[PDB]
Write a protein that binds this ligand. Structure first.
Ligand code: HEM
Ligand SMILES: OC(Cn1cncn1)(Cn1cncn1)c1ccc(F)cc1F
Length: 524
């Protein structure tokens, strides 16, 4: 009889529940631990699945090494399994496709196969607000990008340049980090100065003088609070009742309120011109089906756009300064180009003249190669995906991870990739077939090993603005200052744990005026 064995199942179950809590706790730990390992071993036998990186701790997965050294994690996995491999990350299964084909697979994936907003809405909506970016369908995002792009034109860039230039000079004059009229040399932390210079220049040009004026008050603290809401932690804990989350939520309310106040006052007073992105979105934010963006949505879009560009650009100008700090030869070469293009300084910097500064633009290009601010980009897989020329199938519910920044640092595609060399872009200082997803014709192929601004439908639309901003900034730094490292100091390693891969601080440089007696004018 085995009927008596079925009885012993029941008995065993009863003797189980009657175990001392010291043991049931252990079993509370050992059972999932064993099950996890047993499951992985079975998983490896499945051949329509990419290799899965082994991990001990359930749910957590490979999260620790990934969060700390993601490029080293990728290279190790790449050696062991090749370009396609999966790993577990704090509850989710991430499928990585390395290299140009990975760029194709993910950046050019069909709209039905993957979703960006499904991956990012929880990180971004709390910070930016509702209705925009990733808190809406893709077709809405496509048109939002179209709206923002319409203020990002050549003619706008020509008007932004003297404005950005003024902000940089005002910063050299008034900021405690410089004070070039009282000081001729000094030390700065680039992770202090660049975020401040970035917000000052982006606000003045994209938002206007009103909004820029507000950064000079206590209101600036709100930006700092909202800023801290942009954190990987939001992927796991997007809302938990602490004061981080309430300073953030308050900031979002307070800042979006401020923009609507300006918007509503501009429209009430017929003061809608072609100054900034606010004027632009006001006279141009009606979707194709006739629905107009609310003033709240418009303000939330401003926040997301300004916030994203803030972190990517500030990290980038910080890296530029850090690389140049140990390369006086490059500073020297850049300075000569400045003297040549601007007639020894007797020419005012214009957007057109920026375009005649290839080495300056190659310096940005090369920094973005070595320091892609977003080391990984994700999509959630919505429908089962077959990986071409493999037997692999990526199930829905998986996430795909693309990482052009990793390919940027491979010798195969960039000879001596870990060496900073702006001349590798000689005759190629620009930041076939095209396609238009709703915000303008962009490249159809996304197979370039160099993709600092991504590609496909989620491609960046701030690239020309970023080059404009960074260009003006670096042009003025180069003409005004020399700089170098404190003894023994060199380029810091990246901090991969933050929202962008900014330098590990404190990252300090020593500056000095090329012209100690040069005075910056204006009232202060
Ligand atoms: C050096 C500076 C920047 C870099 C390297 C950069 C990089 C990127 C990348 C890689 C993406 C694709 C993200 C993805 O595929 O998930 C992206 C998207 C985007 N970026 Fe930028 N960005 C920069 C600056 C800016 C600026 C200044 C703005 C606006 C003024 C901006 C606005 C946007 C927008 C609206 C998207 C679309 C996101 C989507 O469609 O899902 N970015 N950027
Ligand atoms: O793509 C981001 C969001 N993100 C993805 N991984 C990490 N952060 C960043 N970004 C890209 N270019 C500029 N910022 C973004 C996209 C659009 C946006 F409006 C804000 C925003 F943070």
């Amino acid at each position: 009889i085995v009927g008596e064995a079925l009885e012993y199942v029941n008995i065993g179950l009863s003797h189980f529940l009657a175990l001392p809590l010291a043991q049931r706790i252990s079993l509370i730990i050992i059972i999932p631990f064993i099950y996890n390992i047993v499951w992985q071993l079975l998983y490896s036998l499945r051949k329509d699945r990419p290799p899965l990186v082994f991990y001990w701790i359930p749910w957590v997965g490979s999260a620790v090494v990934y969060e700390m050294k993601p490029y080293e994690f990728f290279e190790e996995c790449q050696k062991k399994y090749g370009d396609i491999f999966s790993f577990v990350l704090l509850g989710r299964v991430m499928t990585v496709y390395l290299g140009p084909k990975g760029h194709e697979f993910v950046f050019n994936a069909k709209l039905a196969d993957v979703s960006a907003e499904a991956a990012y809405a929880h990180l971004t909506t709390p910070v930016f607000g509702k209705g925009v970016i990733y808190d809406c369908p893709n077709s809405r995002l496509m048109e939002q990008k179209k709206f923002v792009k319409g203020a990002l034109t050549k003619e706008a860039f020509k008007s932004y340049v003297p404005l950005i230039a003024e902000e940089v000079y005002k910063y050299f004059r008034d900021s405690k980090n410089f004070r070039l009229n009282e000081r001729t040399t000094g030390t700065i932390d680039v992770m202090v100065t660049q975020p401040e210079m970035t917000i000052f220049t982006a606000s003045r040009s994209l938002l206007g003088k009103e909004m820029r004026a507000k950064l000079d008050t206590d209101f600036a603290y709100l930006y700092s609070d909202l800023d801290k809401g942009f954190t990987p932690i939001n992927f796991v804990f997007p809302n938990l009742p602490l004061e981080h989350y309430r300073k953030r939520d308050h900031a979002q309310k307070a800042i979006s309120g401020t923009y609507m106040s300006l918007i509503k006052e501009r429209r009430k007073n017929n003061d809608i011109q072609d100054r900034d992105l606010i004027d632009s979105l006001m006279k141009n934010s009606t979707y194709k089906d006739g629905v107009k963006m609310t003033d709240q949505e418009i303000a939330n879009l401003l926040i997301g756009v300004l916030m994203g560009g803030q972190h990517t650009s500030a990290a980038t100008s910080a890296w530029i300064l850090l690389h140049l700090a140990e390369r006086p030869d490059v500073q020297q070469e850049l300075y000569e180009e400045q003297m040549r293009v601007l007639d020894g300084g007797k020419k005012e910097l214009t957007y057109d003249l920026l375009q005649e500064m290839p080495l300056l633009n190659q310096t940005i290009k090369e920094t973005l190669r070595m320091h892609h601010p977003l080391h990984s980009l994700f999509r959630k897989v919505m429908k089962d995906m077959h990986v071409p020329n493999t037997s692999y199938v990526i199930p829905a519910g998986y996430h795909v991870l693309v990482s052009p920044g990793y390919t940027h640092l491979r010798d195969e595609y960039f000879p001596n990739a870990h060496q900073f060399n702006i001349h590798r872009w000689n005759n190629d200082s620009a930041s076939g077939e095209e396609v238009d997803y709703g915000f303008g014709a962009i490249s159809k192929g996304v197979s370039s090993p160099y993709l600092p601004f991504g590609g496909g439908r989620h491609r960046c639309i701030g690239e020309h603005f970023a080059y404009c901003q960074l260009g003006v900034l670096m042009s003025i730094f180069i003409r005004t200052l020399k700089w170098h490292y404190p003894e023994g100091k060199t380029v810091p390693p990246p901090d991969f744990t933050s929202m962008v891969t900014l330098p590990t601080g404190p990252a300090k440089i020593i500056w000095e005026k090329r012209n100690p007696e040069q005075k910056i004018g204006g009232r202060h």
